[PDB]
mmCIF file with all atom_site columns, C-alpha atoms in Angstrom:
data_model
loop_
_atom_site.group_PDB
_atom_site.id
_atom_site.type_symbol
_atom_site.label_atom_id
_atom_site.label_alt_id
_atom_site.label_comp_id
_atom_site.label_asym_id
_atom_site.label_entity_id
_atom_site.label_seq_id
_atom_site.pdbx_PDB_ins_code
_atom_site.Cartn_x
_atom_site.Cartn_y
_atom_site.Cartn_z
_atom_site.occupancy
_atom_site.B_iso_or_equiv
_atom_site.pdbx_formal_charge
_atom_site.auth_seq_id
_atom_site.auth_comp_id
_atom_site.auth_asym_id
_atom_site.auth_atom_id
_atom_site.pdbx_PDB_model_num
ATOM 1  C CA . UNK A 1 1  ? -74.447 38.050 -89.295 1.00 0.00 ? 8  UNK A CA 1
ATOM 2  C CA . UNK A 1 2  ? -73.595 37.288 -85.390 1.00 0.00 ? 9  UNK A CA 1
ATOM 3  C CA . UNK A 1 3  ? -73.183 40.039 -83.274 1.00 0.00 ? 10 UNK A CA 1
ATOM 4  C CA . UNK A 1 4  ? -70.365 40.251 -81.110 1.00 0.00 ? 11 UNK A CA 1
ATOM 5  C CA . UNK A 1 5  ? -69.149 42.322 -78.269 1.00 0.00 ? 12 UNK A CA 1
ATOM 6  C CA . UNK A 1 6  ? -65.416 43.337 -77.763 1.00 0.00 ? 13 UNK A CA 1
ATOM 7  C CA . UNK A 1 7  ? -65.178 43.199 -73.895 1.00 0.00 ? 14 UNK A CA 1
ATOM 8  C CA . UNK A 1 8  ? -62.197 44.234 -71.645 1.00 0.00 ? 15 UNK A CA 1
ATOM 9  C CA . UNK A 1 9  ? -61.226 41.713 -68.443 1.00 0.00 ? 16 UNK A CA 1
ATOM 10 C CA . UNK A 1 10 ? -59.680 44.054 -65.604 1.00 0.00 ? 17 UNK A CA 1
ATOM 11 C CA . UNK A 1 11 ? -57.872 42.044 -62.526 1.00 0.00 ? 18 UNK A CA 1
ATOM 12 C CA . UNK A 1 12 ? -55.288 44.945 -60.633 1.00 0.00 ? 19 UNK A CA 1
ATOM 13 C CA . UNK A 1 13 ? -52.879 45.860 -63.587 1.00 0.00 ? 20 UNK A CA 1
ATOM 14 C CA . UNK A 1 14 ? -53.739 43.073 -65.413 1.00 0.00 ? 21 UNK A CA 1
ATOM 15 C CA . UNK A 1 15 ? -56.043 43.098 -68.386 1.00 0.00 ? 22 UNK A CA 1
ATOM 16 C CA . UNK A 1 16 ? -57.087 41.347 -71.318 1.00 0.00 ? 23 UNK A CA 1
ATOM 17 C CA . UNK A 1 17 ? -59.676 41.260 -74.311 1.00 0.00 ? 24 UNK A CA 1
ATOM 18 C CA . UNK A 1 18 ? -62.286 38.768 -75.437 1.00 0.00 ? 25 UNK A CA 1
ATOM 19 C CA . UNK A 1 19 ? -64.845 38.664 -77.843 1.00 0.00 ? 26 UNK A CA 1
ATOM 20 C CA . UNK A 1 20 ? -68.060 37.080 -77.285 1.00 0.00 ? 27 UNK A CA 1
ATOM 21 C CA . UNK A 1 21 ? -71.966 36.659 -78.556 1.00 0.00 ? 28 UNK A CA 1
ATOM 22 C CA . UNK A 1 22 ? -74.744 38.385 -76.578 1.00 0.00 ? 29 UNK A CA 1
ATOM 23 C CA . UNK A 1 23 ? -76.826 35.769 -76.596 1.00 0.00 ? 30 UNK A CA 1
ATOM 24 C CA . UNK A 1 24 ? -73.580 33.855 -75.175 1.00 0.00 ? 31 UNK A CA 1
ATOM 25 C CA . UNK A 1 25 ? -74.300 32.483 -71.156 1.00 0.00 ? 32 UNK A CA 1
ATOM 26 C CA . UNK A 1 26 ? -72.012 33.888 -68.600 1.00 0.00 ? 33 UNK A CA 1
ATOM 27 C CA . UNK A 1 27 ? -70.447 30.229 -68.247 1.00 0.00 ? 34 UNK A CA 1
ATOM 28 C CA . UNK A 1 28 ? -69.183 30.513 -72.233 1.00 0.00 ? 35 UNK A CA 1
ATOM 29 C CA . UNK A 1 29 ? -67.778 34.116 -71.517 1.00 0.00 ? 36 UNK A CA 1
ATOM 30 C CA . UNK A 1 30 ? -66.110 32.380 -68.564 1.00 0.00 ? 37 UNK A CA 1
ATOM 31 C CA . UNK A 1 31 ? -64.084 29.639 -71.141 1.00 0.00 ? 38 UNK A CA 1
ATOM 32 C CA . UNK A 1 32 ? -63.422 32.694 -73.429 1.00 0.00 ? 39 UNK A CA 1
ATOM 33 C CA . UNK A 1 33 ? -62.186 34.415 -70.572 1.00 0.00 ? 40 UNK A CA 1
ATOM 34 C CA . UNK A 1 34 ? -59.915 31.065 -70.294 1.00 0.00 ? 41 UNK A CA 1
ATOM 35 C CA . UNK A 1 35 ? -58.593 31.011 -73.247 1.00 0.00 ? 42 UNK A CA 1
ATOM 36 C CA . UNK A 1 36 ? -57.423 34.240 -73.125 1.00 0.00 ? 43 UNK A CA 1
ATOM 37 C CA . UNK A 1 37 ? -55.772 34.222 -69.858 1.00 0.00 ? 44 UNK A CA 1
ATOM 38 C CA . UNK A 1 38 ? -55.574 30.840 -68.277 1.00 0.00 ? 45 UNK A CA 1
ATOM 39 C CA . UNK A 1 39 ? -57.551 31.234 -65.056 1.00 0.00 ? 46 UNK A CA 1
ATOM 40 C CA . UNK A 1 40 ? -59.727 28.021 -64.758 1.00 0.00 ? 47 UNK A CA 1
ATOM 41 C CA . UNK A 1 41 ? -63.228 28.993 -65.045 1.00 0.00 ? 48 UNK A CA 1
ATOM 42 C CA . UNK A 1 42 ? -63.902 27.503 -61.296 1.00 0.00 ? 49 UNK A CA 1
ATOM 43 C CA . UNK A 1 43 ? -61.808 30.502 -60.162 1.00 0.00 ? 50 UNK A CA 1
ATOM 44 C CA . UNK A 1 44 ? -63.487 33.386 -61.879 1.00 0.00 ? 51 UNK A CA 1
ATOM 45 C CA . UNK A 1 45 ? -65.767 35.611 -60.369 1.00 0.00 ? 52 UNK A CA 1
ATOM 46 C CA . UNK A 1 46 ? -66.921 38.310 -62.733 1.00 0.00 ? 53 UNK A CA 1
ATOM 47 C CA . UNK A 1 47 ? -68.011 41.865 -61.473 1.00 0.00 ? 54 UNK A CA 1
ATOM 48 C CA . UNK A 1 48 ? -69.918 44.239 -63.719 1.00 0.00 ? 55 UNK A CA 1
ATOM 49 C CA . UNK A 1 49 ? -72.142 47.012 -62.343 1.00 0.00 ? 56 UNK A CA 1
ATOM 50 C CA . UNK A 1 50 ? -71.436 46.220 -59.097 1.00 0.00 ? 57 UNK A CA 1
ATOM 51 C CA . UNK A 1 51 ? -73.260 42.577 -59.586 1.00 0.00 ? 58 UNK A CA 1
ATOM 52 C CA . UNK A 1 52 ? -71.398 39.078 -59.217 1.00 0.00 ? 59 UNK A CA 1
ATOM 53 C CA . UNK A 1 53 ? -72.030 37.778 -63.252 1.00 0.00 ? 60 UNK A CA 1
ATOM 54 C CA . UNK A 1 54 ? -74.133 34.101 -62.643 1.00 0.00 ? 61 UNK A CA 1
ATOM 55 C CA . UNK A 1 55 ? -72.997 31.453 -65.132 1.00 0.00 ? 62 UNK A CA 1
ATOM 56 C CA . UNK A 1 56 ? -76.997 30.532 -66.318 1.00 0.00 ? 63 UNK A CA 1
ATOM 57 C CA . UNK A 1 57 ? -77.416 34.090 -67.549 1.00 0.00 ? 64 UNK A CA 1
ATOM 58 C CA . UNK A 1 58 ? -76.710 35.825 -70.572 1.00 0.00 ? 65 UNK A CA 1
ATOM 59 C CA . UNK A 1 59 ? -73.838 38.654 -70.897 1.00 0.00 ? 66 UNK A CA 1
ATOM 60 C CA . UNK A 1 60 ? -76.534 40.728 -72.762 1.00 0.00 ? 67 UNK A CA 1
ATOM 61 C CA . UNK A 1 61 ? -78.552 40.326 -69.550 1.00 0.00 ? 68 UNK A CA 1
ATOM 62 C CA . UNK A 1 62 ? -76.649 42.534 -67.805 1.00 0.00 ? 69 UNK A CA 1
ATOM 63 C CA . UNK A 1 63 ? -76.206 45.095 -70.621 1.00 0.00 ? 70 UNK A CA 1
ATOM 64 C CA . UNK A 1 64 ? -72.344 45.004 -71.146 1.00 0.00 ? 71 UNK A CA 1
ATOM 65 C CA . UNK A 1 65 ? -72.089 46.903 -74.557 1.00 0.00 ? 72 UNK A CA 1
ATOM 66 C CA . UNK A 1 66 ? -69.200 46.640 -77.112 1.00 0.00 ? 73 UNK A CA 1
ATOM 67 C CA . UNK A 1 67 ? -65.838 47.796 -75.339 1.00 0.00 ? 74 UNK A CA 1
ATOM 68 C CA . UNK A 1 68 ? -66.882 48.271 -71.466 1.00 0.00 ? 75 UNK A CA 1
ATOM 69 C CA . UNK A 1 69 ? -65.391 46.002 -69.006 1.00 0.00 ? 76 UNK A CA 1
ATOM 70 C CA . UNK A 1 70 ? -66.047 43.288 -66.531 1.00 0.00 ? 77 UNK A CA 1
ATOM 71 C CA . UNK A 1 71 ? -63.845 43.012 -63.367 1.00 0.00 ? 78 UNK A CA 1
ATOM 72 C CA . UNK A 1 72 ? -62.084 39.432 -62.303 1.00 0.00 ? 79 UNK A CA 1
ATOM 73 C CA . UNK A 1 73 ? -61.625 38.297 -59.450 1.00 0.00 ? 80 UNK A CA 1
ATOM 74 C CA . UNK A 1 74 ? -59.801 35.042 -58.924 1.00 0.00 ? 81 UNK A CA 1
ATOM 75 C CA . UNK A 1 75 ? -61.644 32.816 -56.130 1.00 0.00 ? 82 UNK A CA 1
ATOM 76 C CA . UNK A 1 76 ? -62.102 29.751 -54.696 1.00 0.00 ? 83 UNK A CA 1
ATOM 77 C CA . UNK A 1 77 ? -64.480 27.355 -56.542 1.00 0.00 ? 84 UNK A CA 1
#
């Protein structure tokens, strides 16, 4: 079976829920984060760990597990 990890987007009081492979690049989180919320991918910066998320690497890369949460931060492309 594919694995999958249940993540939590935090912007302010805002928050929302995808669900995404671990082998999955940061860019393909971004358009799942997009469908769930609307925010062009352009405008997304992603936060976890203190570290700016780059679209060419993996979200297992950075060790998000099932359930923790990436910050958003909507920016200029």
């Amino acid at each position: 079976l594919d694995m999958s990890l249940n993540i939590h987007i935090k912007s302010g009081q805002d928050k929302w829920e995808v669900n995404v492979a671990p082998e999955s690049t940061v860019l393909q989180f971004k358009e799942a984060i997009n469908k769930a919320n609307g925010i062009p991918v352009a405008n997304q910066r992603l936060i976890y760990s203190g570290k700016i998320l780059k679209d060419d690497q993996t979200v297992e890369s950075y060790h998000i597990q099932d359930g923790h949460s990436v910050h958003l931060v909507k920016s200029q492309p």
